[PDB]
Amino acid sequence: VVPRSRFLPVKTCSDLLLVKSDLFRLEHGSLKLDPSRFGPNPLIKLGSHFKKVSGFNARIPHIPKIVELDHLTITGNVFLGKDVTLRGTVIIVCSDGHKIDIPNGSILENVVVTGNLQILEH
Amino acid sequence: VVPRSRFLPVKTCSDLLLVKSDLFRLEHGSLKLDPSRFGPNPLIKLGSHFKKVSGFNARIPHIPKIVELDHLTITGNVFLGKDVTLRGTVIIVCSDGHKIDIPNGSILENVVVTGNLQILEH
Amino acid sequence: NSVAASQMRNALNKLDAARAKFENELDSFFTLFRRYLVEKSSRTTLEWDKIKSPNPDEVVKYEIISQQPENVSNLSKLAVLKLNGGLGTSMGCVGPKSVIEVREGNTFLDLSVRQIEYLNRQYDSDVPLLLMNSFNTDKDTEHLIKKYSANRIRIRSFNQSRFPRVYKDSLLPVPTEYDSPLDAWYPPGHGDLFESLHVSGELDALIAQGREILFVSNGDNLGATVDLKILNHMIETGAEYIMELTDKTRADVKGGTLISYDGQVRLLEVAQVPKEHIDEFKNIRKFTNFNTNNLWINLKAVKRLIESSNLEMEIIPNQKTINVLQLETACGAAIRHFDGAHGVVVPRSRFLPVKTCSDLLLVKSDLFRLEHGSLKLDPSRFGPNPLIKLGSHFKKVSGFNARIPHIPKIVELDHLTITGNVFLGKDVTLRGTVIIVCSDGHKIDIPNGSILENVVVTGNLQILEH
Amino acid sequence: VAASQMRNALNKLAARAKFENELDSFFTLFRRYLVEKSSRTTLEWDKIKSPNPDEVVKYEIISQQPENVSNLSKLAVLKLNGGLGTSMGCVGPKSVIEVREGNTFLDLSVRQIEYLNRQYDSDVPLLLMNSFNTDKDTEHLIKKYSANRIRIRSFNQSRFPRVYKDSLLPVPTEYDSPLDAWYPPGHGDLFESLHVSGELDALIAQGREILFVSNGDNLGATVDLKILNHMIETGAEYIMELTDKTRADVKGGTLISYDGQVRLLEVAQVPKEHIDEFKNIRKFTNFNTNNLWINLKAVKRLIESSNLEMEIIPNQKTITRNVLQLETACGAAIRHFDGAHGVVVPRSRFLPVKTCSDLLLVKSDLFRLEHGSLKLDPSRFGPNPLIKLGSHFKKVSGFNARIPHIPKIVELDHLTITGNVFLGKDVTLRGTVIIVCSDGHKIDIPNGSILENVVVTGNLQILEH
């Protein structure tokens, strides 16, 4: 037996977000977990507009501060802004047809988010 | 001929957002305009769900930081989170029968926002 | 008196009533209100520097109680009170929250009886159930208690205090007469327990009836059975107050805990943590426990501290518009003012609260069996219980039954969260994580027999009898 | 080490005139880069001062100067022309994009100098400084202006190589190996190339004393006589036209006195600690409108002694086979010139056309056209209306799609149009108009509608019955 310390798989862009976040520091080719972080890692379930890697960067070009997040699950067509913070449980689910722009700096915590929202450069 | 300083009518909950904001420090019963603020007040055209004071408080229970705003226009049924910052020009227009919930700590700067976003305490 | 205080004692001069002079009520209100304003001057928040974490003596783990004693004779003294001042409007109900059907037809109060009925029978004893009511509930409870005529329990109810609500702006005692509008009073919290417990004379009568300890629990806590091993621990270590604590889960933060402060154990709530430090408090990793409000309180000690008026608890100035101001206190806070008073951890087994219809689904499911008024968890179930977060079309109880008339098989479910207008069919099974979220405007009928497992469900779907 | 790597790799050839004098002129910059790349490339903040009436002249002064006609014999006019028209959908130079009443940029300038000439009897030469991305298309194009009251001439600037950002080796290998591998090194290249062409020799040779340089896409850059005489009375060798800065132009360049000389401070030269002060338009009130009056003789001498040397602008860019484009700005050269200083003009002489929004403005009843110049309407009391057209309006094609009939807007303050919106014949836009149309919708504003102070939203289709 060995601790998950050494089971850190990247199967899926959902895994790509985890290892890209502030939840890890990169030292000598190794992802060392934060001292703050005293649990299991958060359960990230990004839906499929996040499957391919071009899709994922399109949508998460600025990795959110996820250090106090348990369960994130995002569904449908969603674009996260710069400097977004996720906390507790965040369920964002944009239904077929629509698309949601989550504003820059927005900070979501224990919340279900749904609908249309388009944000455009004036 | 005085400076506009000695003209600060409060006719409308738009005026109310202004005088209630980080634009002014209060001191011995007088609104002192913030020193950094270089020139004319920002132009605030809140729409009609904002007319009565009841509605105003409904949607802005947390006056957004606006010390760097020029133009804000808000039309339709819109709710504003804790710690919003409005820089430059913000236009939030929400169509008939919709609703939009601006998420806590969002930094809206120079944008047009439109759509239908519900944010629900999970 | 003070300037604003002599204006309120002037209302004590301001306040068809033959020898029923509620001066007792008015006076107790005065002491609180005056001090409320006195504490209005200073920072009224414990110094963070001097808050220290409890040591094994002050907060005893469960294992330590567990394998120790078992003494029947003890029941001679034990009494059981159930806090009953709550209305059930937040669950969409006219009346005492505790008369809502919670499981298989049984109300909270039924289950209270059943559980105690069975305590009395198992050891041929006579322990009484005590229902502390309030002016909002007292009327209904005395009628509702009449049903158990010829049971194996002596249910005895009593009212707490009536206190006058105030105005946020003018800060003057809102009403005028012994009863102008009912929606003008308020019960002074469950800290007001002690005064009206002895003002009713249940303090005496219980001591006189030969009883020495109350086991106090909430109306809406189904887990709070009588733990003999505790009644013993409390009686051997001759403690005068025992608070039951359970491990704080990620969604328990806001709740208060016991600390060690100036060599006493006392109850720290968020309101009494300074704003620079609240986040540290809410940190579950630094505050492993919280108060379940399952309290064992030495009756003798209550008399002592009441007659030597020392029982002094923090003021919660809750505000409601019917803006207005309600000054109330909590039973738990008094803990410091008791000799040998300490805390005891206990498993969630006995923290089973029904705040919310989301909680109603949990306790209604196959996840529990009902034995002797007790919800015993399945043998299969070896974890934490599932996190159920039903959205608001589920807030009132008529709404919830409309929508979940047939409780789903939830035995292998972790996280369920449903949002918007959703109707669950007969024989639905939930597994793993189920996130059903129907957006504004729409409504989703989940077909009969449907079985959802690790799935996000969304959209419109209407199902109609052909 | 990066030096000899550049000079050796740059020396490979694979022609009658050796284009080396540029590849070497490059090496001078490309090297300099390394030197500065290391240490401080930020002027000491603590030494900057705000100019004397000496160093920035207000118009109040110039306003009353002669308006001399007989010195056009000293004037030669230049427009910068290395800019493409793609960011407006179009292709070819920017300068040939229809701007007003079928007139391109080029057309309007020609019309103006032609007018200058005819009205005054003077043969003022027009000069288009092209680039490789414009030269040929401008050479054939200009030939349309045959038999005119205008002596038009063009020329090309330098064809510097791009450099690979990571490897720091030059992009091309051959004299033509991809057309992606070259870049024109900015309007600071003006002099250097004005020299290599020989118009510099020709202008002096033919008695032209002063160049009046302006951007291609500036429509207000007319010849101001009132300024010409100021410039000659003072004998100053370089004059930079500056205009007040507003909310929308914080990060434009401005002019300052600094350790004895007047120079242009751009944002890059400011310590990262200080931009929260640089952008206070209470403290830095003008910007370089890029209308530059310039003494040709002074240019000759300065080139000959290699005294002209502007601030390095790296500008990192990308193309598919990241890369670096070291370039420079004529405006910044002002320090090296003697007597040099600035003059505060009205915004009139700043009318950039960067965007189809600008295009709506200059095409509207806001301006009457007269002999190649946009005259702003007399009634119009103060600042131009603020036009923020959205993205379906970016390309010129789309613009014409939706506004084939420029709306009357002489009384507009703010217009914002977002989404897919079509505008009828004879619309009038008063005050504030906000038309925002959601994703997947369309809105047809009906003929002769008067929108004044409104928010319009929805989904209206209007169909020829």
- PDB resolution in Å: 3.1
Contact D280 B38 (CB under 8 A): yes
Which chain A residues are Cβ-neighbours of C458 within 8 angstroms? 75, 93, 95
Give the Cα separation of D351 and D96 in Å (integer).
17
- D11 known ligand binder: no
Q: Is C355 labeled as catalytic in the residue annotation?
A: yes
Radius of gyration of chain B (CA): 15
Q: Would you say C438 and C424 are in contact if contact means Cβ atoms under 8 Å apart?
A: no
Superfamily of domain D354-465: Hexapeptide repeat proteins (2.160.10.10)
Kind and range of the H or E element at D164?
A: strand D163-164
C389–chain B nearest CA distance, Å: 7
Contact C419 A115 (CB under 8 A): no
Does the beta carbon of B41 lie under 8 angstroms from any beta carbon of chain D?
no
Domain ranges of chain D: 1-353, 354-465
**In the numeric block, which tokens belong to residue C361?**
């689904």
Phi, psi of C6 (to 5 degrees): -75, -20
Does the beta carbon of B12 lie under 8 angstroms from any beta carbon of chain D?
no
Instruction: List strand residue ranges (DSSP E) for C66-193, in order.
Output: 78-83, 87-88, 93-96, 101-103, 106-107, 129-133, 156-159, 163-164, 166-167, 185-186
Kind and range of the H or E element at A111?
A: strand A107-121
For residue C99, give the nearest of C128, C47, C140 by alpha carbon.
Answer: C140
For residue D374, give the nearest of D387, D359, D386, D385 by alpha carbon.
Answer: D359
- D82 known ligand binder: yes
Choose from B14, B37, B38, B94 for mutation: most chain D CBs within 10 A: B38
| C76 residue type, one letter | S
Q: Would you say C294 and C244 are in contact if contact means Cβ atoms under 8 Å apart?
A: yes
Contact A93 C437 (CB under 8 A): yes
Give the Cα separation of D394 and D386 in Å (integer).
16
Does the beta carbon of D390 lie under 8 angstroms from any beta carbon of chain B?
yes
For residue D360, give the nearest of D420, D419, D287, D427 by alpha carbon.
Answer: D427
Radius of gyration of chain C (CA): 24
Give the Cα separation of C396 and C394 in Å (integer).
6
Contact D438 A118 (CB under 8 A): yes
The residues with which D179 forms a beta bridge, in sequence order, are none
Q: Would you say D409 and D379 are in contact if contact means Cβ atoms under 8 Å apart?
A: no
**Chains C and D lie in contact, requiring 3 or more CB pairs less than 8 Å apart:** no
**Out of 3.20.20.140, 2.40.50.140, 3.30.365.10, 3.90.550.10, which CATH number does the structure's domain D1-353 have?**
3.90.550.10
- C425 known ligand binder: no
Give the count of beta carbons closer than 10 Å to the beta carbon of residue C168.
10
Does the beta carbon of C389 lie under 8 angstroms from any beta carbon of chain B?
yes
Catalytically annotated residue among C254, C355, C376, C426? C355
Burial pattern D313-326, b for ≥16 Cβ within 10 A else e, equals beeeeeeeeebbbb
The contacts of residue D317 (CB under 8 Å, 6+ apart) are D162, D183, D323, D324, D325
Residue range C1-354, CATH number: 3.90.550.10
Half-sphere exposure of D202 (CA within 13 A, CB side): 13
Half-sphere exposure of A17 (CA within 13 A, CB side): 29
Contact B109 A107 (CB under 8 A): no
DSSP track, D265-279: EPGGGS-TTSHHHHT
Tell me, rounded to whole angstroms, the distance of Cα C64 from its chain centroid.
26
Burial pattern D161-178, b for ≥16 Cβ within 10 A else e, equals bbbeeeebebbbeeeeee
Residue range C355-466, CATH number: 2.160.10.10
Give the Cα separation of B57 and B74 in Å (integer).
15
Please report, for residues C19, C27, C199, the alpha-carbon distance to residue C22 in angstroms, rounded to integers and kept in the order given.
Answer: 9, 9, 11
Give the Cα separation of D58 and C361 in Å (integer).
78
Half-sphere exposure of B88 (CA within 13 A, CB side): 14
Minimum CA–CA partner of B116 in chain A: A116
Give the count of beta carbons closer than 10 Å to the beta carbon of residue C309.
9
Instruction: List strand residue ranges (DSSP E) for C155-312, in order.
Output: 156-159, 163-164, 166-167, 185-186, 213-217, 241-247, 257-261, 264-268, 289-298
For residue B48, give the nearest of C51, D202, D455 by alpha carbon.
Answer: D455
Give the Cα separation of C340 and C362 in Å (integer).
37
**Chains B and A lie in contact, requiring 3 or more CB pairs less than 8 Å apart:** yes
The contacts of residue C194 (CB under 8 Å, 6+ apart) are C302, C306, C311, C331, C334
Please report, for residues C363, C381, C382, the alpha-carbon distance to residue C378 in angstroms, rounded to integers and kept in the order given.
Answer: 12, 5, 9
Half-sphere exposure of C378 (CA within 13 A, CB side): 18
For residue C432, give the nearest of C402, C452, C418 by alpha carbon.
Answer: C452
> Helix (H, G, I), strand (E, B), or coil: what is residue C381?
coil
**In the numeric block, which tokens belong to residue D428?**
């009038």
Give the Cα separation of D137 and D376 in Å (integer).
32
Does the beta carbon of B38 lie under 8 angstroms from any beta carbon of chain D?
yes
Catalytically annotated residue among D18, D251, D354, D375? D354
For residue A37, give the nearest of A78, A81, A77, A4 by alpha carbon.
Answer: A4
**In the numeric block, which tokens belong to residue B69?**
């705003």
Give the Cα separation of D87 and D94 in Å (integer).
9
Which chain B residues are Cβ-neighbours of A89 within 8 angstroms? 122
Give the Cα separation of B8 and B14 in Å (integer).
12
Chains that touch D (3 or more CB pairs under 8 A): A, B
| D81 residue type, one letter | N
For residue B21, give the nearest of B31, B30, B35 by alpha carbon.
Answer: B31
The contacts of residue D40 (CB under 8 Å, 6+ apart) are none
Give the Cα separation of B68 and B82 in Å (integer).
18
The residues with which A72 forms a beta bridge, in sequence order, are A44, A90
- B20 known ligand binder: no
Half-sphere exposure of D157 (CA within 13 A, CB side): 28
Instruction: List strand residue ranges (DSSP E) for D354-447, in order.
Output: 367-370, 373-376, 386-389, 412-418, 421-423, 428-436, 443-445
Superfamily of domain B11-122: Hexapeptide repeat proteins (2.160.10.10)
**In the numeric block, which tokens belong to residue B105?**
């700590």
The contacts of residue B4 (CB under 8 Å, 6+ apart) are B40, B41
